[PDB]
Coordinates of C-alpha atoms in Angstrom, one line a residue:
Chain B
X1 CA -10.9 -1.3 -26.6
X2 CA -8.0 -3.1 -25.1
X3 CA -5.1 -1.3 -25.3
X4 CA -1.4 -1.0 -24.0
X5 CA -0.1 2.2 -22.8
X6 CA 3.7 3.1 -21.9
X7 CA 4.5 4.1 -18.4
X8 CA 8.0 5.8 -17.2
X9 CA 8.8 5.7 -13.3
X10 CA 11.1 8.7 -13.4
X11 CA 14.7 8.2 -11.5
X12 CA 13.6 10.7 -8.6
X13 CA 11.0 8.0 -7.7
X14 CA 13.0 5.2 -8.1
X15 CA 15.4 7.4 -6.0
X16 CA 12.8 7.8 -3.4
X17 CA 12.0 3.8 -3.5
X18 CA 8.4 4.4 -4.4
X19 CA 8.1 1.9 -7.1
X20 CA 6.1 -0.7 -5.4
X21 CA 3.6 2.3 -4.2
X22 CA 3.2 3.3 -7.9
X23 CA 2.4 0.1 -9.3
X24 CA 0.4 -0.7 -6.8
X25 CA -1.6 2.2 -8.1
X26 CA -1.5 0.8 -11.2
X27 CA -2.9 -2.6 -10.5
X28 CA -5.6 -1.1 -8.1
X29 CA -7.0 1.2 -10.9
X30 CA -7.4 -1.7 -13.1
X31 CA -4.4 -1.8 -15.3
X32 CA -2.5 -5.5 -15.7
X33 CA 1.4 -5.0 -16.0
X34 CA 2.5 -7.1 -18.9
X35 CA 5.9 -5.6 -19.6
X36 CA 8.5 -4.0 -17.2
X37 CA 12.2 -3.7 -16.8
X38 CA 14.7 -1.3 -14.7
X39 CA 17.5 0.4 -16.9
X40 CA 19.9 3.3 -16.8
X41 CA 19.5 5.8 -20.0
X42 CA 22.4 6.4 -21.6
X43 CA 22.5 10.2 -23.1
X44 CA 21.7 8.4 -27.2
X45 CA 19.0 6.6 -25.7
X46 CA 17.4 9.6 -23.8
X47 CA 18.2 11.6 -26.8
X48 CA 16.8 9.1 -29.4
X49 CA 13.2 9.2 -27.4
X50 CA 13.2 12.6 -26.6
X51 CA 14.1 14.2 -29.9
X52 CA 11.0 16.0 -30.3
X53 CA 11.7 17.4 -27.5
X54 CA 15.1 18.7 -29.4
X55 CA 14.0 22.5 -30.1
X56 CA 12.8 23.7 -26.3
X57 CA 15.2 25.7 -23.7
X58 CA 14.9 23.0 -20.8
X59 CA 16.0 19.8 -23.4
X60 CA 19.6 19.8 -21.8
X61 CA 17.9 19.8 -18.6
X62 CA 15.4 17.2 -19.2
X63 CA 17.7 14.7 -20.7
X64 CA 20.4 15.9 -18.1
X65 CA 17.5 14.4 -15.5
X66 CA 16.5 11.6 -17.3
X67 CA 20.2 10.0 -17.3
X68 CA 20.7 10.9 -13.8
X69 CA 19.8 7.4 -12.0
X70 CA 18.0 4.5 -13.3
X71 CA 13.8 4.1 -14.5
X72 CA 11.4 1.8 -14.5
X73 CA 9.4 1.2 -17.8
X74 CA 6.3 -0.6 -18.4
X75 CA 3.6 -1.3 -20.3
X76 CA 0.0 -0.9 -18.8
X77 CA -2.6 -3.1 -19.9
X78 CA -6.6 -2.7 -19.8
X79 CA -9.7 -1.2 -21.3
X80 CA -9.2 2.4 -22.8
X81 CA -5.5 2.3 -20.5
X82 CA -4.2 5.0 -22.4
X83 CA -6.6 7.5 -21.6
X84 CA -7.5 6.0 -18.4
X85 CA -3.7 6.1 -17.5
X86 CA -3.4 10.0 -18.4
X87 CA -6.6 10.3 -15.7
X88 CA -4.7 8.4 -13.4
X89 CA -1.3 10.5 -13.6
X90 CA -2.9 13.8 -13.0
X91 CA -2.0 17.0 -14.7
X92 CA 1.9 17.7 -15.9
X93 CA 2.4 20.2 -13.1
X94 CA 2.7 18.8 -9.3
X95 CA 1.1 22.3 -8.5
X96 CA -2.4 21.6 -10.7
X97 CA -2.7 17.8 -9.9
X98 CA -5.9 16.8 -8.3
X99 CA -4.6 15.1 -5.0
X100 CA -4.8 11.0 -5.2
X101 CA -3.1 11.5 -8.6
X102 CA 0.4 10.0 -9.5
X103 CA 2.1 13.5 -9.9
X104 CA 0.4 14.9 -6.8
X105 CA 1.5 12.6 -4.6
X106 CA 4.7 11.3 -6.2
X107 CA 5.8 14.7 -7.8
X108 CA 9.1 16.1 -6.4
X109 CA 8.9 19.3 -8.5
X110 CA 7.5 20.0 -12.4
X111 CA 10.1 18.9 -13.9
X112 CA 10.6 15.8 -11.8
X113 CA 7.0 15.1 -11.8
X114 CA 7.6 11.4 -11.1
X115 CA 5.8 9.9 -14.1
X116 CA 5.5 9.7 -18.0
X117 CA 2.5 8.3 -19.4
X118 CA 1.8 7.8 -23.2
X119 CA -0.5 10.9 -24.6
X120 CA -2.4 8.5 -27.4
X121 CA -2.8 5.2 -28.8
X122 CA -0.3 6.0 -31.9
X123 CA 2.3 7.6 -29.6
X124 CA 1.5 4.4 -26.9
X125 CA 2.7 2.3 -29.8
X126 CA 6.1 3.7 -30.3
X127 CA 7.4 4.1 -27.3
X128 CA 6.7 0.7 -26.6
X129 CA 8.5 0.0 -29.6
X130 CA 10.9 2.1 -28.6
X131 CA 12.3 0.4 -25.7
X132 CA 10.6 -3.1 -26.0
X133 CA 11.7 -6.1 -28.2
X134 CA 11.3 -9.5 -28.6
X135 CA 9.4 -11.1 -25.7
X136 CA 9.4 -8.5 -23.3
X137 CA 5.7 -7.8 -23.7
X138 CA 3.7 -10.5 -22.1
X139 CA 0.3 -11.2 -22.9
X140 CA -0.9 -12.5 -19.9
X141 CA -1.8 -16.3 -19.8
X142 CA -3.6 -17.1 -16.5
Chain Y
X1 CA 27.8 -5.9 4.3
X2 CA 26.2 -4.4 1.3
X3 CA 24.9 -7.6 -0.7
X4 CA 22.2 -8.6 -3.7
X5 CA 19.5 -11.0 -3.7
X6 CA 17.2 -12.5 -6.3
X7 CA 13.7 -12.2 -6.1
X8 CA 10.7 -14.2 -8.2
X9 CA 7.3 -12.9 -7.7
X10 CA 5.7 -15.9 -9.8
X11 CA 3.2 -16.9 -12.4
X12 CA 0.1 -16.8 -9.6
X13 CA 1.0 -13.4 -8.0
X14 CA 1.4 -12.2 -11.4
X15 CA -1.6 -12.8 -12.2
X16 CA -3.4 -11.7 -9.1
X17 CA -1.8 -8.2 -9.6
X18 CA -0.3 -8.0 -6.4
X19 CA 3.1 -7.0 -7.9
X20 CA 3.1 -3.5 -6.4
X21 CA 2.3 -4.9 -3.5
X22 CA 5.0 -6.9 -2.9
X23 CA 7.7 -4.4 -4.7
X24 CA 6.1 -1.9 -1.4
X25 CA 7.0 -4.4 0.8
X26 CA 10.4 -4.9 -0.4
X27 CA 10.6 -0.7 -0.6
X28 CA 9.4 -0.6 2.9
X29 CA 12.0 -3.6 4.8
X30 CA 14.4 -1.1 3.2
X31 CA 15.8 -3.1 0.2
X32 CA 16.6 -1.0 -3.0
X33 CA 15.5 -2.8 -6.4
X34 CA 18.5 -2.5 -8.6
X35 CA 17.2 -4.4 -11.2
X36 CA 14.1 -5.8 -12.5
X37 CA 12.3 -7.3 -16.1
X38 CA 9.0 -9.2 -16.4
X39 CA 9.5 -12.4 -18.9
X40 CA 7.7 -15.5 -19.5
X41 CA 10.1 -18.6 -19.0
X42 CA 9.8 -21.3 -21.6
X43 CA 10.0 -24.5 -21.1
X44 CA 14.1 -24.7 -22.1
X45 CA 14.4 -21.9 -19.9
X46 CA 12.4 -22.9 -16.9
X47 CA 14.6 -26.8 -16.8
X48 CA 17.7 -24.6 -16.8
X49 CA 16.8 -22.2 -14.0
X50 CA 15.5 -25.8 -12.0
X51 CA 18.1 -28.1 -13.4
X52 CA 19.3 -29.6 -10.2
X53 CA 15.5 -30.5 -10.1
X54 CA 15.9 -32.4 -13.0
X55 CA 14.8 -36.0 -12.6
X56 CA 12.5 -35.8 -9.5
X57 CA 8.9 -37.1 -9.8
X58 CA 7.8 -33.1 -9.0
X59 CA 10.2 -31.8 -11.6
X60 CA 7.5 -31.9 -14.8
X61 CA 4.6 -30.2 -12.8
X62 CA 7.4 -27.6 -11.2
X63 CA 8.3 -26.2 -14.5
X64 CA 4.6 -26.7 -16.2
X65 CA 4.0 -24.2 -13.3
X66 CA 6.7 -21.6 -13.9
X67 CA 6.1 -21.4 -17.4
X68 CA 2.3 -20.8 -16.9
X69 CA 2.1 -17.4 -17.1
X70 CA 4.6 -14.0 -16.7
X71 CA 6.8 -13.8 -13.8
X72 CA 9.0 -10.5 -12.6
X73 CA 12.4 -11.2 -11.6
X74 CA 14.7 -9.1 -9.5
X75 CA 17.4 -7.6 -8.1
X76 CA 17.2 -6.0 -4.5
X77 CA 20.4 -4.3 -2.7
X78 CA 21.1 -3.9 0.8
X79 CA 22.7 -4.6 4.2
X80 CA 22.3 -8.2 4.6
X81 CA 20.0 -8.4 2.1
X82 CA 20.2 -12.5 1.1
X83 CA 19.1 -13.0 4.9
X84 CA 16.9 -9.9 5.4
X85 CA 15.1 -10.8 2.1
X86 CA 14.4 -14.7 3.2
X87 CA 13.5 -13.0 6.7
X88 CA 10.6 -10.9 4.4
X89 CA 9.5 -13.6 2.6
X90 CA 8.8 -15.8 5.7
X91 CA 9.3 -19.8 5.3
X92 CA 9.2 -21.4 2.4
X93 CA 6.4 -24.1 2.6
X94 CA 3.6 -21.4 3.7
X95 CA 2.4 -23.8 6.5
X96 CA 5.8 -22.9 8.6
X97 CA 5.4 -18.8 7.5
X98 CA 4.9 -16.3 10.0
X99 CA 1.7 -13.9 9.8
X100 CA 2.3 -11.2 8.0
X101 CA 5.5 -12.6 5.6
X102 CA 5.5 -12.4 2.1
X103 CA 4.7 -16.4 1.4
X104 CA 1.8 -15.8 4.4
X105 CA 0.1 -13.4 2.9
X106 CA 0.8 -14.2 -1.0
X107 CA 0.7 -17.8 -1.1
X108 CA -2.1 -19.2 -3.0
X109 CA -1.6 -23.0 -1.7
X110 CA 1.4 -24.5 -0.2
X111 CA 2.7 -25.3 -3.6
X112 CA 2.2 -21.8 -4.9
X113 CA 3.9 -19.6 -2.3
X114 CA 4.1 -16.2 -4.7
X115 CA 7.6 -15.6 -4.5
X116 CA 11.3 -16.7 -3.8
X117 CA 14.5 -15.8 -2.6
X118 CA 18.2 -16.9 -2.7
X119 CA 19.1 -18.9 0.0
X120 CA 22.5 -18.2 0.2
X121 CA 25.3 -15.4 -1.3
X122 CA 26.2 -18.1 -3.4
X123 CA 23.1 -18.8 -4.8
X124 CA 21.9 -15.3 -5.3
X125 CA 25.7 -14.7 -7.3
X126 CA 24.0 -17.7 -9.6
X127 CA 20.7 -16.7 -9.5
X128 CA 21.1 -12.7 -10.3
X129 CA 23.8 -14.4 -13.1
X130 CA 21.4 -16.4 -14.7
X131 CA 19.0 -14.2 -15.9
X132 CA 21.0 -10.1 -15.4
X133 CA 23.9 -10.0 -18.0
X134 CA 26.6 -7.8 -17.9
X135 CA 24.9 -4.6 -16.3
X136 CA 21.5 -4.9 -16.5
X137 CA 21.5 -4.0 -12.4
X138 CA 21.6 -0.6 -12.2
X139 CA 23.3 0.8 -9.2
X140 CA 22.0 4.2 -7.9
X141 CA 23.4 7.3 -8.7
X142 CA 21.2 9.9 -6.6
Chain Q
X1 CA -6.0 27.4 4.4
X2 CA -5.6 24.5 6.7
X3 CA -8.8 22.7 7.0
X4 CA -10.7 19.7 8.4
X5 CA -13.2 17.8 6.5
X6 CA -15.4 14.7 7.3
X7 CA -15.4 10.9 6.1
X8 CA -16.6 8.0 6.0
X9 CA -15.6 4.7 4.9
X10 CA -19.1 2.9 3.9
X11 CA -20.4 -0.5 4.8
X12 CA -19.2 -2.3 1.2
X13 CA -15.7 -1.0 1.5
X14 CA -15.0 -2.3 5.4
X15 CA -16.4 -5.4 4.5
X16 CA -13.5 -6.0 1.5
X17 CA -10.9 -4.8 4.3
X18 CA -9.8 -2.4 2.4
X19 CA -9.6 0.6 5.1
X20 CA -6.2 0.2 5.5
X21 CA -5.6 0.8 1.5
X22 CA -8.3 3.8 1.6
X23 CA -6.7 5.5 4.9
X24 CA -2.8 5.1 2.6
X25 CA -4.2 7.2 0.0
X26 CA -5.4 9.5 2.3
X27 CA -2.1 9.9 4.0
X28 CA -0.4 9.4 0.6
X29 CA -2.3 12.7 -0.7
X30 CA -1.1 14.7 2.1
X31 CA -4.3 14.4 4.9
X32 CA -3.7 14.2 8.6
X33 CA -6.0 11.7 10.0
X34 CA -6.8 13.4 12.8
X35 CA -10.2 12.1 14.6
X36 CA -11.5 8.2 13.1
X37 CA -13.4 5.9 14.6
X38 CA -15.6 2.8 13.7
X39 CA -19.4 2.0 14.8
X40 CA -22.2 0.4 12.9
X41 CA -25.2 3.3 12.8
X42 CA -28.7 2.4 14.2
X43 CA -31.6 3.2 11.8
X44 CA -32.1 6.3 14.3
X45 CA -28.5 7.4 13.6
X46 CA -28.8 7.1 9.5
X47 CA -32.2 9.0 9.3
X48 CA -31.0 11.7 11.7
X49 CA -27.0 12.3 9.4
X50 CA -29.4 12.0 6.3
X51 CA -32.2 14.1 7.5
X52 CA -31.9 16.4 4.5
X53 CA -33.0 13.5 2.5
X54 CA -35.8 12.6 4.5
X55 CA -39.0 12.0 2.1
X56 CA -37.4 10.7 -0.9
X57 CA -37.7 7.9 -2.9
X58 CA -33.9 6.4 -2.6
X59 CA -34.2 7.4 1.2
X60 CA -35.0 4.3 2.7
X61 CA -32.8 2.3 0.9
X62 CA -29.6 4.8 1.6
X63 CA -30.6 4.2 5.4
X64 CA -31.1 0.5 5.1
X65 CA -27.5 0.4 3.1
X66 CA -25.6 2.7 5.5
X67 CA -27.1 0.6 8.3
X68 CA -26.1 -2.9 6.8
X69 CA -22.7 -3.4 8.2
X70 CA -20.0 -1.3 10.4
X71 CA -18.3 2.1 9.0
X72 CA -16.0 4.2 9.7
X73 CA -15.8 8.0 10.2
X74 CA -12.7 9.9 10.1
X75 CA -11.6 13.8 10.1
X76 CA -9.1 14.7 7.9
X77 CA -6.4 17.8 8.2
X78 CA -4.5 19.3 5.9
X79 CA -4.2 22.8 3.2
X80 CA -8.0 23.4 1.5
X81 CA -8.8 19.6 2.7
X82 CA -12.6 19.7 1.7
X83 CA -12.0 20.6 -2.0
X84 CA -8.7 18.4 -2.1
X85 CA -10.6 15.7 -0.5
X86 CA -13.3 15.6 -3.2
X87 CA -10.9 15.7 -5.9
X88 CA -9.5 12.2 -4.2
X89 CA -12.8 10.8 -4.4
X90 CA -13.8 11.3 -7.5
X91 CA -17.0 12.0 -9.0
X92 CA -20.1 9.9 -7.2
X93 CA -20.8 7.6 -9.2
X94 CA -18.3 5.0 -10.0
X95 CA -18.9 4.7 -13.9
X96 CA -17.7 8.0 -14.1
X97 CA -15.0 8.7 -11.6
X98 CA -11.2 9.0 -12.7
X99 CA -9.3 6.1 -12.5
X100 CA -7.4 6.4 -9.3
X101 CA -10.0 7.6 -7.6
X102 CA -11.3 6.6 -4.3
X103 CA -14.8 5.7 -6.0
X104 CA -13.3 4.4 -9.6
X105 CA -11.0 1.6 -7.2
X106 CA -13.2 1.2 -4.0
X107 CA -16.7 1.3 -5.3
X108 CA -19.0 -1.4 -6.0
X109 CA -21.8 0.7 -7.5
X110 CA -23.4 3.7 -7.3
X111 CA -25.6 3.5 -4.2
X112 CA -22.2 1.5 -3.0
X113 CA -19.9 4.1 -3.9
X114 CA -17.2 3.3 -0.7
X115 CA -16.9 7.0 0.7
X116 CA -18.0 10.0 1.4
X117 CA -16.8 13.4 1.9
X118 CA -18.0 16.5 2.7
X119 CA -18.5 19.0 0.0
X120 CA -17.8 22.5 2.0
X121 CA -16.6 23.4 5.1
X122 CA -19.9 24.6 6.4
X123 CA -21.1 20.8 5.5
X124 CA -18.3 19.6 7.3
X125 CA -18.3 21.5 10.2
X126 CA -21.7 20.0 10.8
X127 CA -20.9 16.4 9.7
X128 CA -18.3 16.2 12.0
X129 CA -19.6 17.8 15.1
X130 CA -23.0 15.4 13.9
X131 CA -20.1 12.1 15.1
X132 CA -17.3 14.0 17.1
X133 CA -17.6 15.2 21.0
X134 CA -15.2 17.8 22.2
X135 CA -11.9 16.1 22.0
X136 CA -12.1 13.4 19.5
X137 CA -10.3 15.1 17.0
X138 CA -6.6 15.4 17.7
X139 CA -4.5 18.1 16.6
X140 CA -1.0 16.8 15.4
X141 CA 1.9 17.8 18.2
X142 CA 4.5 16.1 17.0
Chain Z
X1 CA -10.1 -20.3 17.8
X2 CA -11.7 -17.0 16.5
X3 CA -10.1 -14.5 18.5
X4 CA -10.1 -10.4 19.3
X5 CA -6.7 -9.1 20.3
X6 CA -5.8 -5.2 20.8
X7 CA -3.5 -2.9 19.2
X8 CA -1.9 0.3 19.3
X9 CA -0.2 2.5 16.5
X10 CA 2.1 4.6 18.8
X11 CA 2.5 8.4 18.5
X12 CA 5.7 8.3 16.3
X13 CA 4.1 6.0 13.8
X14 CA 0.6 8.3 13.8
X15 CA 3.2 11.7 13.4
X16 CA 4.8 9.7 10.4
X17 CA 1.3 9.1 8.8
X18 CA 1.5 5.9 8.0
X19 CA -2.1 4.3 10.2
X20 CA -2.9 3.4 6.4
X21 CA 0.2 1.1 5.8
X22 CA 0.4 -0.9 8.9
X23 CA -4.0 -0.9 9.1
X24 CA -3.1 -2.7 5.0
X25 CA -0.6 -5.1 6.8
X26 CA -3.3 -6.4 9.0
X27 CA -6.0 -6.6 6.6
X28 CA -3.7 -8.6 4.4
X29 CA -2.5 -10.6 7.0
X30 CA -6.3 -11.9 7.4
X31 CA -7.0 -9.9 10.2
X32 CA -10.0 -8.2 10.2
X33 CA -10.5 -4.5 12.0
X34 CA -14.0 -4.3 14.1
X35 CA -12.8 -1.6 16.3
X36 CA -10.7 1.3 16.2
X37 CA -10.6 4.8 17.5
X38 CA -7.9 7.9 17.1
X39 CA -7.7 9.5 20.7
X40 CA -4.9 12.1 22.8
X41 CA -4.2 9.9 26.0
X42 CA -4.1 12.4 28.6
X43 CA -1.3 12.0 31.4
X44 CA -4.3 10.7 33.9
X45 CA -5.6 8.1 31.4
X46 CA -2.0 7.3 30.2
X47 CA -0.8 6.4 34.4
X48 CA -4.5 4.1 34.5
X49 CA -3.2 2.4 31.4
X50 CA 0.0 1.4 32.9
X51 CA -0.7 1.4 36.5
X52 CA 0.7 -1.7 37.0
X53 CA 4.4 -0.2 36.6
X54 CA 3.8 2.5 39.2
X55 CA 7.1 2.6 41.3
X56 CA 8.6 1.1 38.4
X57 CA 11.7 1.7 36.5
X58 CA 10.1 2.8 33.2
X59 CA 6.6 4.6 34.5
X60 CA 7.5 8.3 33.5
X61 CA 9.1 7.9 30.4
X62 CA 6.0 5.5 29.3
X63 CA 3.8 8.1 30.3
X64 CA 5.9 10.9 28.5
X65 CA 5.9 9.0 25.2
X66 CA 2.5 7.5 25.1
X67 CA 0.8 11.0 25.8
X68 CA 3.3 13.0 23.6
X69 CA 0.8 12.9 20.6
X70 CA -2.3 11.3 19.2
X71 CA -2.5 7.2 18.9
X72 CA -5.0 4.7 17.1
X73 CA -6.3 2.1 19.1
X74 CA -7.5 -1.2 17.3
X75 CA -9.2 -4.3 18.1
X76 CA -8.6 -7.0 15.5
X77 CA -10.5 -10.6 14.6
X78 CA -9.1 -13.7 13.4
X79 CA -8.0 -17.5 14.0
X80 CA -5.4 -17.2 16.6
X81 CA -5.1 -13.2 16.3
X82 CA -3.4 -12.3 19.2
X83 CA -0.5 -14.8 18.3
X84 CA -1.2 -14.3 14.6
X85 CA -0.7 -10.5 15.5
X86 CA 2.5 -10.5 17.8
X87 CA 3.9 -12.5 14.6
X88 CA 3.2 -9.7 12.3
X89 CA 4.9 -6.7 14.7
X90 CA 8.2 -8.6 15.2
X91 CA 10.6 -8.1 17.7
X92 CA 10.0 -5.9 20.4
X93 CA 13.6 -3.9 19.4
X94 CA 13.0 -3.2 15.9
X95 CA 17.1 -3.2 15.3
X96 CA 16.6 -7.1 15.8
X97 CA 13.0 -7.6 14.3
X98 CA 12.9 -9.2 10.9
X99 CA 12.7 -7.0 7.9
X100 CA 9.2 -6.3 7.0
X101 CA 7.5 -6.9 10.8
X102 CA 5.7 -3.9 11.7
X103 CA 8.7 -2.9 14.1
X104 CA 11.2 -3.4 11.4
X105 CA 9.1 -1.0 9.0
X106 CA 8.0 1.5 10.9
X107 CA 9.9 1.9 14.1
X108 CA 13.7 3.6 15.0
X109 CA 14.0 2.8 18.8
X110 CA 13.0 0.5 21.4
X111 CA 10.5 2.8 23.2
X112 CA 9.5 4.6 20.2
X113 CA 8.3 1.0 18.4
X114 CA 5.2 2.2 16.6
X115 CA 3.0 -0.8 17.6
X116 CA 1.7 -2.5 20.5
X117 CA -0.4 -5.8 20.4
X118 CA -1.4 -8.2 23.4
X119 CA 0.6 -11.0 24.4
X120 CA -2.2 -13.2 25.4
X121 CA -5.6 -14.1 25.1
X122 CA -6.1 -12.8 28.8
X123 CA -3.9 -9.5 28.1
X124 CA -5.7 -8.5 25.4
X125 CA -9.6 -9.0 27.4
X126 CA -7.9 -6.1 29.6
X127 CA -6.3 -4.2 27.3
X128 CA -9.7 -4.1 25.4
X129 CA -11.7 -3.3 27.9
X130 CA -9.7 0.0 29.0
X131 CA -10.5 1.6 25.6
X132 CA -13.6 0.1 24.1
X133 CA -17.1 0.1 26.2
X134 CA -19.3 -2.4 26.1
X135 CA -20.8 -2.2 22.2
X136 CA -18.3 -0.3 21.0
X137 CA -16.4 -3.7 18.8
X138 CA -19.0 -3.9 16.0
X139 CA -18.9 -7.6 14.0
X140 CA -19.2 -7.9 10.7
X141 CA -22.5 -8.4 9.6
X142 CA -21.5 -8.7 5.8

């Protein structure tokens, strides 16, 4: 089915100026970008999306990370995208991604992978929600 | 000196998917994108953003054009940048661009060029204005 | 271990210009190009690289395909390049290859897959001395 | 008119690994790649090459560059290429060529420029004919 999947550019590769690279990875495997905006977390925002995370030893460092520079969200569009977007990130950890994938060649280290990618439809849906409103998902017209 | 630019990649590179493309070449001429949304201008919005068109016998087919389908606007920061980005981009009317500019490579017809750039500081401060409220460019950090 | 493995960059894949894409994901994934060249194999050249497959039913039609238009062949360098090349390709036939993937983005079909790439290094020692002479491949020294 | 002009990816550009990205510029600047090879100019083949400045100012140091590591050498098709092409690589001096020509991207100094390409239709006959034998430019036959 079609479906829309969240993407996060994390800020050590918006750091390194590889956002054009990585959505041109996008848009060659397929997926149409019909949402997308550049913002700085601030630490509620960081800590409003990655509460679940709120219960680990490496939260402080995680949201310490994400509010270090600005991101690049999106939404990924396309025929099973979530799943087909998970493929196309590679594994969590730099060291076990199969080369070609986002993490393997955009990964700085495992925590600064590079990239977030939704893990399911239902969870897709939220973080969408999460940090898209009114008109800022495009269906795409032409 | 350190300036901003605006930057359109429009409805017909849109939907050709060659926005990574273009965001590489930006990346690569050395700008840094400091700000960045995908929209889809309405008709209201698209007469505002071309006002001083207003009038003029292309005016109607000029906005039916922009509002045809998603656009990404942006922000790009650098040394020069208003006249390094128009260097990028190549002429305006693609029969005048170089090989190998932006409007050479991306233009579908003369009319649809793919992209735009201020032409000036001062149109870039009213440009960026226009559609990036008070700090939606986010300067880098790291 | 540093290691060199073979490719090539079939008929369908030249013919969409996309070398330039395929060779940036190869260097984007950490290979050293290090020996590449393009030619446009004689019927005498396909049978003799596919010898092994001499006999079978899909022979004639891989030699007639390989033989259609201009390839090209390349040696790639770089820490357990044959696996790590593989894993870049993705699986052979397109319909089941990862997206991101050299054969999920670049292939037209399955008998048009776009690449190939040798699958040990006692295969690729052989398919690369089968299109290499002493000194066509170029150690990196600088 | 249809024409065939030569190129060369310089060592520092080959050491950067970026043959991909400028071999993408020139496919999407319409230009279409029938011959290419990687090779090592020796010192001997490097002095042939540029003869013509022997007991000129700049004859060792050409020499001492050009053979300092591998290079890619290109022949590449299209309507008015060889002007088509020297549009594309920019300014000789990459401080002065516009942002985004291949000397902008991917060079730092004058010498060290990254690319070559002929500056006529008569230069680029020669230039051709030092590094490709007769048969070795394959057209496109698809």
């Amino acid at each position: 089915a079609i479906e829309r999947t969240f993407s996060i550019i994390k800020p050590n590769a918006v750091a390194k100026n590889v956002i054009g690279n990585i959505f041109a990875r996008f848009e060659a495997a397929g997926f149409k970008i019909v949402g997308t905006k550049m913002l700085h977390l601030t630490v509620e925002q960081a800590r409003g999306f990655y509460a679940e995370h709120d219960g680990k030893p490496f939260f402080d460092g995680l949201v310490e990370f994400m509010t270090s520079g600005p991101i690049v969200v999106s939404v990924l569009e396309g025929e099973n995208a979530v799943q087909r977007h998970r493929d196309l990130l590679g594994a969590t950890n730099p060291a076990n991604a199969l080369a070609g994938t986002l993490r393997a060649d955009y990964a700085d280290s495992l925590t600064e992978n590079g990239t977030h990618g939704s893990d399911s439809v239902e969870s897709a849906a939220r973080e969408i929600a999460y940090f898209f409103g009114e008109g800022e998902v495009c269906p795409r017209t032409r």
